[PDB]
């Protein structure tokens, strides 16, 4: 049959970037023509493969990673990039073989009062490995003395909310990202 690409892209809601979701896609015929012939995508870069020339290629597994970040932070979803998203949330390998798809979702993920469903990781001791996922909520110890799970000075919660408002600029508006991986 056909691959469930419509479930991931046209999903009702997307995950936070720190808790980025992964759906394994296999045992199906992928019709990539639905994707690269769509004028609704704002960002569409492929690394190591040509977009139009994928219907004649086969792969053992295809992974779809979805989340939501700021518009300014979309540039970090690329090999060899640095920043809070690439370092502490979603890291792509330097030898990444896949495509990155993103589109503006201010009409869906932004709330007037302030959304609470989309978060990002702010503090972490070290950069993530490629395709690593860290959903831990341990109190980040920034000072010399320990925190024993209590907030305060030099004891900050490692996650921070975006608070997408519709009046924000396009750089601060939410963008739904879907990363396709091949092997």
């Amino acid at each position, epitope marked *: 049959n056909l691959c469930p690409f419509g479930e991931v892209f046209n999903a009702t809601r997307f995950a936070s970037v720190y808790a980025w979701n992964r759906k394994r896609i296999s045992n199906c015929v992928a019709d990539y023509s639905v994707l690269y012939n769509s004028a609704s995508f704002s960002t569409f870069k492929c690394y190591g493969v040509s977009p139009t020339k994928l219907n004649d290629l086969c792969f053992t597994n295809v992974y779809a990673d979805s989340f939501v970040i700021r518009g300014d932070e979309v540039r970090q979803i690329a090999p060899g990039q640095t920043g809070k998203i690439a*370092d502490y949330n979603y890291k792509l390998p330097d030898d990444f073989t896949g495509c990155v798809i993103a589109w503006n979702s201010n009409n869906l993920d932004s709330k007037v009062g302030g959304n609470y469903n989309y978060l990002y990781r702010l*503090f*972490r*001791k070290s950069n993530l490995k490629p395709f690593e996922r860290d959903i831990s909520t341990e109190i*980040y110890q920034a000072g*010399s003395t320990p925190c024993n799970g209590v907030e305060g000075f*030099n004891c900050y919660f490692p996650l921070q909310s975006y608070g997408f408002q519709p009046t*924000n*600029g396009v750089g601060y508006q939410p963008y739904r990202v879907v990363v396709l991986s091949f092997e």
Partner: antibody
Amino acid sequence: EVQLLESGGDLIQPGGSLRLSCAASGVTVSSNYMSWVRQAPGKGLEWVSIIYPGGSTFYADSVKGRFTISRDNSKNTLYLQMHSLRAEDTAVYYCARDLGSGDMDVWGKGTTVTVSS
Amino acid sequence: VMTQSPSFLSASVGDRVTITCRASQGISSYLAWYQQKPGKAPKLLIQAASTLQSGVPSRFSGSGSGTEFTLTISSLQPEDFATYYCQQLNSYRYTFGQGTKVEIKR
């Protein structure tokens, strides 16, 4: 208590090089966003460089390719390597702890750098 | 470019001061205010455009959202006369304002 003590400021010819230190107490340099911010004589504040707790570094366009930020975990010390210095680099250099969002709550007393022939 | 106004401001002890910081486009609520006296390091006053930092007296009030942000000192004090800067938060540039110097009126 919590304090940042910077040193290394000196008079230097244009094109030369200088290394600034920033020893910390009460704050772990390796676990925080650490930034250098300078202020030219009689001018406003200018952010220079930052090093994330994960090791990533970012620089301003006025100092890109000429300044290098680094740290020593064993000494709890922040550094600012400067080469190819220019006259407009004359400023008082502070090291500050960034709370992640951009706001700097802990500041040093600053060391003075004068670049002139 | 952060356009801050006014550059110089004269007020008396006990007055209500308003400093304006305008961004070229919407920065939501990502703005911080600093206070710097001559020869001293800057002191953080308010982060996130409307969160008074712990320890700063209740005089300093921060508000504004979108493209216009204001720092409001309810009752000015002798130790409040200094230069005030605004900074854009959560940006790759870490852009600062030109500064507003508050001076005494006699």
